[PDB]
Amino acid sequence: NAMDSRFLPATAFIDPEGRNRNEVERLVQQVVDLILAKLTGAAERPPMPEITIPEAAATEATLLQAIRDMVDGSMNPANPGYIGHMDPMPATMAILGDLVAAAVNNNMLSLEMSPSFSRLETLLLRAIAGLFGLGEQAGGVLTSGGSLANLQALAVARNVAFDSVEPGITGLAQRPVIFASEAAHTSLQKAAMLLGLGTAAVIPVRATADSRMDPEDLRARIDQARGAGQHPFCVVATAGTTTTGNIDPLAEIGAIAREHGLWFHVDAAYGGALVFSERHRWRLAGIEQADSITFNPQKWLYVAKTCAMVLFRDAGVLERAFRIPAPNMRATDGFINLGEIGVQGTRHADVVKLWLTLQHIGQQGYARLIDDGYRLAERVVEGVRQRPFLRLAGEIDTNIVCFRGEPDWLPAERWDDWNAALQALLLREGKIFLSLPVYRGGRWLRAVLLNPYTTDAVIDAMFKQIDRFAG
Amino acid sequence: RFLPATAFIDPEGRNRNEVERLVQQVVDLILAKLTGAAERPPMPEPITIPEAAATEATLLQAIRDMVDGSMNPANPGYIGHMDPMPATMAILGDLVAAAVNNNMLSLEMSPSFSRLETLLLRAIAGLFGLGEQAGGVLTSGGSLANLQALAVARNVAFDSVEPGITGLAQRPVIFASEAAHTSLQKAAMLLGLGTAAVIPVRATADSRMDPEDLRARIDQARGAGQHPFCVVATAGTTTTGNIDPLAEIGAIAREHGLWFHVDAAYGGALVFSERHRWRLAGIEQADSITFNPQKWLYVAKTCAMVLFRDAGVLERAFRIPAPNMRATDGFINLGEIGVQGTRHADVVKLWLTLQHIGQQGYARLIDDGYRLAERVVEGVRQRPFLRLAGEIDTNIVCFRGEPDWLPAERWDDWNAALQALLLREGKIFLSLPVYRGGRWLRAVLLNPYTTDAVIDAMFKQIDRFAG
């Protein structure tokens, strides 16, 4: 009983027989109090902030100070001025869900290690799949981020195309390739690299002025690849591109993919949230035919990171073309160890925050949040339209507006400096955070209007600052 | 159509009271469950997304149901898996992480966390003896850690980052103990190697890789026109908790010019123990190490890392082509050098836990595990109907009934029956892995509240079942 020893602090663990209850409760309460103070007081911190392992147990005071230092030095999307990333303030229940998940400390790896969570996740994901219109065989798993979801979808596409689970892909005569919009996520190059495809395997497809993949170009690239002696196996349409928030023409892309016998993956990491909005979900038309979908509740569903999933129209594909040889060990109620069918083995129980958050907000709540996001975005667009020195990236499909100064008082070569300077000013003096992505070979301002506490006033304040900066 | 007042925390305090109450209710509920964990056995005895916001009572009930329906490693009888009750600071660390909701993807999205993680991992790497250039990243589990190490080994060997590996004439292969983790197979499949790319090396009766076999397998693969690029030693095998002879394996790998990866997912914890870290000797020479604080460091899942002896390797042989945007203080966006992009700030729970427990605490915890393990071993030795899988290297004991009153064909049935009985009657959870073509009982002596009495109780039950 180390917990009785002088080598462990009394509160290192929670005594299961209640013997350290009071001490634990104190320590827990201190953190809780501190955290709530920080969150309820989040508008007091700017959107962006301005090591040895000890021999002996640290004091409560050191621990608390560390937490305080951690919170203070962190980015603060809770601030209404934080309008620059698809990284939102977490829903309250998401924060609580993680507390619960950590407390129980179950493992998604297997049913015996997560007997409730595993079942809940499977069922919930089936439900979500239904929202996407995927059909009766549809299913999936939660993954620790979108990248892993894309990686898994691609891994399945690859395995299905090449029968690679046991022999791998080193044999291949024709290089396997995938097609994505030039605006698609970098996780597609990283995945390709991990998959043994190489980064070059991701063939960029021309996107329109509105940053939507051009189906004529996709068709052209597929033909070009075949001509090149490459073996196209997958097309990735993106619903809500990372930079500009645009949504690929999913129905057309899907059709092209289907025509060509290509796995159709839809990277709906951000845009997938629109399934909760009757008003906006038509934007996703064609998604229902996807072989797989990546969707990230951590983004537009406000679930504390990480919360992501990949859904397959046919979940059984995970068994056929992913899961490694091992004894079949399904429970009598029919569930499967999730680890067998995921990139991860051990995995945190994200389902708890997801389930809690979905219930608390509800479909109506999301529909509302989404509408407000669109409204804020439209405000930003109208504001850009009003100013000639400022240009939009293109039309918007989501609550994301990418724009930049293209001031005629400067050579184009100095536009990046101007935009960087403006972004710095907006942050330093505005206390408004916009990202400054590299886009189209240039530095562009980026607004993602997620914070539910962002207001028309914040937007107005932003444009007033921009106006002053620009004269 | 609307939102619950508490759906978010108002950053100007407008909902502070409601938020505080809701949080307090969950916190009180969780504490009750945890401080009361022994009252719940080690294992537990339509889903739609609603249109409208659920009530707080519904949510609280959902949490109760979820906890109740969950495995309970906190129970002292839970002695079956490398899945521990969480350290207190780990639970709290997750609460903190979730609240700030930073993203490990980039410095901009986690300015403290990124720096803290890099520095901490450098410290940990030093503990492993990796040297001045050593570093790593946290990953959402050991499997990812193994996957990343292998991806690097592959990229280094085959220059695969941009062109991939499909061109290859000679099949790339790696060697691992026949006892090694299935995440290598998965990883091999992910990496485009195929599961069959992991060539099993004979393990001894003690479930340790046999160096001579390793040498033999490498020669054989080369003979068969394969391209060996990595040897994986396992410091703490999943089933039996055995440690491969790391120095010997490492020497062999080096002799063969093979990347040496040590899967220390479990056994890596030993670095915290002055008494037992000699067990890892030779680990210091690894090219890469996988280590999972979520196992024997008691950090709530997930917490894992891959460390490289040369952190620079991640830039050379992993990171995708992208503009260079190191911060002025020299840090890099972690997303660029990890399998994951967006990632939860596991560093918070890790840092807090390590601080709270300390090296002394872990050393005690570890010693205590060996002591329980030793008790289990003693108990097995005392009973002729029970056999040990082999000698133990960690706080894990794999054993099974091999009763002479049954045909060997019925041994699996006997053990499954015993395990079911122990769980149902004794409230003691032993895992029943498949090992050596059979079902074996497995004990992981992790719970700090597992005692000698629990072990004695297990044996009395075993004796009763045996007759």
Side-chain angles (χ1 to χ4, degrees), chain B residues 355-426:
Chain B
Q355 285 184 266
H356 194 207
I357 298 175
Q359 300 195 47
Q360 292 172 208
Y362 281 123
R364 189 66 161 74
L365 281 165
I366 288 167
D367 261 330
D368 280 356
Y370 275 104
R371 305 212 189 262
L372 282 170
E374 274 148 27
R375 209 178 172 78
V376 172
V377 170
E378 293 158 32
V380 170
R381 284 193 174 136
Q382 271 320 106
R383 307 166 163 72
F385 57 97
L386 291 185
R387 312 284 312 259
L388 285 176
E391 294 185 337
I392 60 163
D393 298 318
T394 56
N395 60 334
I396 302 186
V397 185
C398 175
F399 65 103
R400 87 173 170 160
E402 283 182 13
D404 69 10
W405 63 88
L406 288 169
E409 14 288 311
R410 303 309 305 290
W411 287 357
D412 287 0
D413 284 338
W414 193 88
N415 289 284
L418 180 45
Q419 186 277 344
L421 177 68
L422 273 167
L423 179 54
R424 175 188 89 246
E425 315 270 277

Side-chain angles (χ1 to χ4, degrees), chain A residues 2-3 5 7-9 11-18 21 28-29 31 35 39-43 48-49 51-58 63 70-71 73-75 78 85 87-92 95 98-100 102-107 112-113 115-117 144 147-148 158-159 165-170 172 175-176 190 193-200 276 298 302 304-306 322 324 329 339 342-348 352 355-356 359-360 362-365 367-368 371 433 452-453, chain B residues 1-2 4 6-13 16 24 27 30-31 34-38 43-44 47-51 53-54 59 63 66-67 69-71 74 81 83-88 91 94-96 98-103 108-109 111-113 120 124 140 143-144 154-155 161-166 168 171-172 182 185-186 189-196 294 298 300-302 318 320 335 338-344 348 351-352 354-361 364-365 368 439 448-449:
Chain A
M3 274 313 283
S5 89
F7 304 97
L8 276 173
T11 56
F13 292 100
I14 305 176
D15 192 299
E17 296 190 82
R21 168 170 323 230
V28 167
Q29 201 64 47
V31 179
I35 283 302
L39 268 48
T40 62
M48 296 290 293
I51 296 308
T52 49
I53 297 134
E55 165 170 351
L63 290 171
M70 289 184 317
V71 170
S74 291
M75 84 153 164
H85 277 306
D87 294 80
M89 52 146 44
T92 302
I95 298 172
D98 270 356
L99 174 70
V100 169
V104 307
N105 198 32
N106 280 206
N107 188 352
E112 101 177 333
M113 304 164 171
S116 67
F117 298 164
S144 303
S147 300
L148 296 176
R158 180 206 65 188
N159 297 348
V165 164
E166 294 184 60
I169 52 166
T170 62
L172 293 195
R175 189 167 186 210
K190 192 197 276 174
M193 176 280 277
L194 292 167
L195 293 173
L197 312 182
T199 56
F276 295 99
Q298 87 211 2
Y302 296 91
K305 280 165 274 281
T306 40
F322 184 99
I324 71 186
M329 294 300 293
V343 160
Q344 296 164 271
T346 295
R347 171 159 68 73
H348 172 256
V352 185
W355 180 227
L356 291 176
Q359 302 179 256
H360 194 210
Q363 296 198 48
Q364 282 188 359
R368 178 47 129 85
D371 265 337
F433 171 77
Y453 297 99
Chain B
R1 185 208 44 196
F2 59 88
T6 63
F8 292 99
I9 293 158
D10 189 310
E12 277 161 355
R16 165 177 291 119
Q24 202 57 56
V27 168
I30 287 307
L31 274 181
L34 269 60
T35 61
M43 298 285 289
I47 299 298
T48 86
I49 294 105
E51 271 318 293
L59 295 173
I63 296 166
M66 286 186 325
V67 172
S70 281
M71 85 149 171
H81 274 307
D83 292 79
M85 58 147 36
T88 303
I91 302 167
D94 269 350
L95 163 72
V96 171
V100 308
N101 200 31
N102 277 217
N103 194 339
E108 164 171 89
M109 304 168 166
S112 55
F113 292 162
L120 188 54
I124 293 180
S140 301
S143 288
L144 298 183
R154 181 206 64 194
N155 288 350
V161 169
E162 281 188 277
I165 53 166
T166 64
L168 293 187
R171 220 172 98 147
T182 51
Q185 275 173 319
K186 194 185 295 174
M189 177 280 287
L190 282 159
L191 294 173
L193 317 185
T195 63
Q294 89 207 353
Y298 299 87
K301 282 162 274 271
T302 47
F318 187 94
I320 75 180
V339 162
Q340 297 160 273
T342 288
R343 169 162 69 80
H344 171 273
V348 178
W351 183 223
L352 294 177
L354 287 180
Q355 285 184 266
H356 194 207
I357 298 175
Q359 300 195 47
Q360 292 172 208
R364 189 66 161 74
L365 281 165
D368 280 356
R439 289 275 175 150
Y449 298 88

Side-chain angles (χ1 to χ4, degrees), chain A residues 6-27:
Chain A
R6 63 170 76 93
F7 304 97
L8 276 173
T11 56
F13 292 100
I14 305 176
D15 192 299
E17 296 190 82
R19 293 182 183 174
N20 67 357
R21 168 170 323 230
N22 289 342
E23 307 104 281
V24 167
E25 277 183 337
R26 169 194 169 128
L27 179 61

